[PDB]
Amino acid sequence: PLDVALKRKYYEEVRPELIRRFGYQNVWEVPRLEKVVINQGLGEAKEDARILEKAAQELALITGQKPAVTRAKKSISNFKLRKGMPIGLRVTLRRDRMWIFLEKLLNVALPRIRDFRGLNPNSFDGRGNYNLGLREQLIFPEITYDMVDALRGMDIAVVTTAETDEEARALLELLGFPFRK
Amino acid sequence: LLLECTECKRRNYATEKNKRNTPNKLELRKYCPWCRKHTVHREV
Amino acid sequence: MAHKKGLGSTRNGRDSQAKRLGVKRYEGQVVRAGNILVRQRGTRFKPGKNVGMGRDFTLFALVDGVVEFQDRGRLGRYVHVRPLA
Amino acid sequence: RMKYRKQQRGRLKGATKGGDYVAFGDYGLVALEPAWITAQQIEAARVAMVRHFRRGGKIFIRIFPDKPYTKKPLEVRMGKGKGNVEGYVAVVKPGRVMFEVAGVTEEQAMEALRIAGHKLPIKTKIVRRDAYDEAQ
RNA sequence: CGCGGGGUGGAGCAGCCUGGUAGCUCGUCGGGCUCAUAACCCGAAGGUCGUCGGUUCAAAUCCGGCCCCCGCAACCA
RNA sequence: AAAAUG
RNA sequence: UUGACUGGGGCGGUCGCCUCCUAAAAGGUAACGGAGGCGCCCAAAGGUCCCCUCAGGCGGGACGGAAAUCCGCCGGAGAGCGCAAGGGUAGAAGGGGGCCUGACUGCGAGGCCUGCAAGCCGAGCAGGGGCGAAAGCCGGGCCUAGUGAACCGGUGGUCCCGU
RNA sequence: UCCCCCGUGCCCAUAGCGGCGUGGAACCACCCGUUCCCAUUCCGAACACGGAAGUGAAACGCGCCAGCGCCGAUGGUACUGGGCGGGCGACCGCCUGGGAGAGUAGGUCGGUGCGGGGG
User: Which residue lies nearest E56, CA-to-C1' measured?
Assistant: First the structure.
């Protein structure tokens, strides 16, 4: 709860193999890691007393921070909800809180993800940093089955201080990021 | 609406203008009277 | 007679009255305080040394003196009053 | 086919734009007098152009109508004309190169344009090339 | 030339100035009754709302552009 | 004292 | 008593105000010339202090259009600025937040415009206030339309007059 | 005096974009932490405070490059105060002063006051 393996390992284990594998010089020219943004979209805040500040904190538990209720930037008549208010929850884990969450992700969630075979090595596709979305919200150790009253996963982004997806891809293949080659 | 503010317990007017249906009623706010300096001035 | 049958789809007779704008006091003109210097649409001329503008962007002198104009490109065009002796 | 229109007659001064140069094609048709050329005219020329040498080469019509020509219904006065009615036109100042041909013999080309000129309500002149350019 | 009324499932009429819900009768379709047809009975379907776009979160509905449809005026010499 | 045709 | 304009009159259209153009590079400028708005709206859409910066385009991302919400670059303004157009504007007039009510009272140098009478801007002084540590800013709203002399009355108020 | 750097103003793109190497002693930044001040519709990311271990990789500073951007003559015309001819007209032309816009040659990856810290 201050320092965790993933974090730990990253240093006394990942850095090296990387320094070598690729071949750097300044520890800062390295493939640091610094931001994870688990964000939800939900679907609405429409009729029938739709509070949905429920999955709000449901999300908090799975993470640590409180998400920010997101609001509409435009208005679309096509599918209801327009102009303002509405919802689109988001949260930003940095340092500590971040490391851990990932570590919890990469050792319990994904596993267990419905079926699972790996991850999409094309999701970076090149542009530094990654991305991915989970369908179920109950694929987390903290939350329960007798808890969730309705499925609603989301998507999480992650940021690399490196550029080439090559690098980025290595850094995560090392951090334990599985890959459906 | 053509509103004006009657300093409670005296005279004077400010001659404002509210928007009724558009959240109104109970208009009143610190204004400066002629009979010495400030009070609040109600509606009416 | 040999009459016709003309009519008017005229739906254009209209216009607002002129509001006469522009530099009212060009550079070099000695002016007293208050003399509005420029009547402008927007901020066509930014206020400079000893010059203030009000609600309608009308720029006017703040002291007694000569009017001086100035270009500042990316910054804009300014107008001000330089006092004297 | 656009924008807000039914515009002012306006006039044609010196032909400061009456005198370009064969841009594509090989030979050409430059205008000598200023005027408004009704689309009706352009086509009526172009057509006869192609039609002169059935299954021939390419025709380039650099001029292009866009000016709305209005006109009253046969009455008196009361607001601008119904306008258009007949249509649009292009403005040609003495010197502009209206049409230009290519991919054909001069005997065929030259004689082709000559006809066009009869269609246009102006006086024309025919040109070759090798002139202006931006080379060194 | 000008006014003003109107284009909505197959036919004939609502709904539009008071923007979000397309209503009625007839007929089309399925099932009954009858020896059978009608009639009668039960149950369904079916509409780019004339078109080319504009304003709006949203247009049968509000604003302009023509295309056919209908009426009223077009007088003094 | 009684609810069309083939 | 049953208006005027009017390429004769009638019929038709129009009648005040705002914005482009016509308008000929100061203003101003006609025509039954071209083309659109207004007869309202905000108790926050107003003060001030403190923060933030758009629209798009390109990838990457559970449901997910072709822009719902996220992440990453590029993007000086093409967004925004309540409603027409124009000018202005991110070195903010735009987006958000905290306290507020100067959408004050007495005044008003000096000008703009102008036949009149109207309309418009306005520093500064006084009083008693707001926001800011402060310098300071504050007499409504990015700005121009949203309006109507007098007479006759109506409601209040008050030093006045009252045969 | 002439270098280097931290604040700042001015000229307001010839200082821009994008490339290419360099700079850490100083400065500057990034960094080290979140106990206190104060912080983010959730994040000390940004604001902020306390520290200085490590770094010049980011960012900034300083140089070189012309591919993009920006600038840009001279000539020569268009147009034109004023004056003036020809032709029936449509239009054409001269005299006398002014004189672009495009395009060419070419220029440019800055210039410059003020105050500081260091050799």
Answer: A77
